[PDB]
């Protein structure tokens, strides 16, 4: 028993972290096979960041301007290209520590581990969710750009995020590994609106199921509800509408606890309308939404 914000073991990803430098700028890169991936803003100076023409800036750069260092070894850059907001630096040596990997564009509401890095060196690992408004609430300092988010399935690392920027609002934004930003963000120093975020309803239900599995059952009531009645409450409290697809994803948790999804919804409705009354659920005094139903099943079944 017990329920924590658990991240994936980071070893497979730590062996991929490199340092990329272009002139004055130093950030993290991801070395997979003979390609080093990093945010394209590595080629900018602070003056360029206000409104960069990346095609023009990249043209004034040659292979020898990109310093790629893997620990102590300097990698030789034999090619460079821009794919959307990432730079792809072809190097002459394949990473001997390249694990089985995939590049995936995660859906909003899904979770992933972040390996925060500085100067190509890992500092820490934490679990977070892609918010419905395509931002992430991570922990990043200057130098962290190029740190990646990933999931692990058996021995396959699915890279899903690369960190690009922190907006003046404190939100964190970045791209998939093909350089496409999640959300409406652009890699330029301009004020950017993130847009209204919502609570991931299916994730809060999954966490309520984790609470039931872990002995916290105070919030369980003698009531039930319908999807339409529940969604009226969800709309009022800026929660995502619960669909039959979400009910189906919750199936394993419903089967494990013997508590119908709509009965769990009724508990959530009373929790939204009355609050927690100063009580806690899994050590928290607020409804947690950064655990997917898969995260709960994995944590409560022991998937290695």
Of 41, 163, 172, 246, which one is the catalytic site residue?
A: 41
The tokens of 68 are what? 């790629």
Strands 66-70 and 73-75: antiparallel
∠ Cα 210 107 182 (to 5°): 130
Q: How far apart are CA 281 and CA 299, in angstroms?
A: 17
Total residues contacting ligand OE6 by CB under 6 A comes to 14
- CB atoms inside a 10 Å sphere around CB 119: 14
Binding at 280: pick from a copy of itself, ligand OE6, none (beta carbon under 5-8 Å per type): a copy of itself
Taking CB under 6 A as the rule, does residue 42 contact ligand OE6? no
Nearest to 74 by CA among 117, 36, 39: 36
Active site residue 160: no
Q: How far apart are CA 125 and CA 7, in angstroms?
A: 7
Residue 127 forms beta bridges with which residues? Answer: 113
Task: Write down the residue that tokens 């009580």 correspond to.
Answer: 279
Binding at 9: pick from a copy of itself, ligand OE6, none (beta carbon under 5-8 Å per type): a copy of itself
Q: Which is nearer to a copy of itself, 52 or 122 (CB)?
A: 122
Taking CB under 6 A as the rule, does residue 49 contact ligand OE6? yes
Residue 32 forms beta bridges with which residues? Answer: 35
Binding-residue pattern over the window 145 to 184 for ligand OE6, x denoting contact by CB under 6 A: x------------------xxx------------------
CB 76 within 8 A of CB 93: yes
Q: Which is nearer to ligand OE6, 176 or 240 (CB)?
A: 176
CB 242 within 8 A of CB 202: yes
Compute the residue count for the chain.
304
- CB atoms inside a 10 Å sphere around CB 5: 14
**Measured from the CB of residue 141, what is the shortest distance to ligand OE6 in angstroms?**
5
Binding at 285: pick from ligand OE6, a copy of itself, none (beta carbon under 5-8 Å per type): a copy of itself
Binding at 83: pick from a copy of itself, ligand OE6, none (beta carbon under 5-8 Å per type): none
Binding at 221: pick from a copy of itself, ligand OE6, none (beta carbon under 5-8 Å per type): none
Active site residue 80: no
Binding-residue pattern over the window 86 to 125 for ligand OE6, x denoting contact by CB under 6 A: ----------------------------------------
Q: Which of 144, 175, 201, 231 binds ligand OE6 (CB under 6 A)?
A: 144
Helices 261-274, 227-236: inter-axial angle, 10-degree rounding: 30
Give me the residues that bind a copy of itself (CB under 8 A), please: 1-12, 14-15, 115-119, 121-126, 128, 137-144, 166, 170, 172, 214-215, 275-276, 278, 280, 283-286, 298-304
CB 149 within 8 A of CB 104: no
**Residues engaged in binding ligand OE6 (CB under 6 A):** 1, 41, 49, 140-142, 144-145, 164-166, 187-189
Question: Where in the sequence numbering do the catalytic residues fall?
Answer: 41, 145
């Amino acid at each position: 028993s017990g329920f924590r914000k658990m991240a994936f073991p980071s070893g497979k990803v730590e062996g991929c972290m490199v340092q990329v430098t272009c002139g004055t700028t130093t950030l993290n890169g991801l070395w997979l096979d003979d390609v080093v991936y990093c945010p394209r803003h590595v080629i900018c100076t602070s003056e360029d960041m206000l409104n960069p023409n990346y095609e023009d800036l990249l043209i004034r750069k040659s292979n020898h301007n990109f310093l790629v260092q893997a620990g102590n070894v300097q990698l030789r850059v034999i090619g460079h290209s821009m794919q959307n907001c990432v730079l792809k630096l072809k190097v002459d040596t394949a990473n001997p520590k390249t694990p089985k990997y995939k590049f995936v564009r995660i859906q909003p509401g899904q979770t992933f581990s972040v390996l925060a890095c500085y100067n190509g060196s890992p500092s820490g690992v934490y679990q977070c969710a892609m918010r419905p408004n395509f931002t992430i609430k991570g922990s990043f300092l200057n130098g962290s750009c190029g740190s990646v988010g990933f999931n692990i399935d058996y021995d396959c690392v699915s890279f899903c995020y690369m960190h690009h920027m922190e907006l003046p609002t404190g939100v964190h934004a970045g791209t998939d590994l093909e350089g496409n930003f999640y959300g409406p963000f652009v890699d330029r120093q301009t004020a950017q609106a993130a847009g209204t975020d919502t609570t991931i309803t299916v994730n809060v239900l999954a966490w309520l199921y984790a609470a039931v599995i872990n002995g916290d059952r105070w919030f369980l009531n003698r009531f039930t509800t319908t999807l339409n009645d529940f969604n009226l409450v969800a709309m009022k409290y800026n929660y995502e509408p619960l669909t039959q697809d979400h009910v189906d994803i919750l199936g394993p948790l419903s089967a494990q606890t013997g508590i119908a999804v709509l009965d769990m919804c009724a508990s959530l409705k009373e929790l939204l309308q009355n609050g927690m009354n100063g009580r806690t659920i899994l050590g928290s005094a607020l409804l947690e939404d950064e655990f997917t139903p898969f995260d709960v099943v994995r944590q409560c079944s022991g998937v290695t």
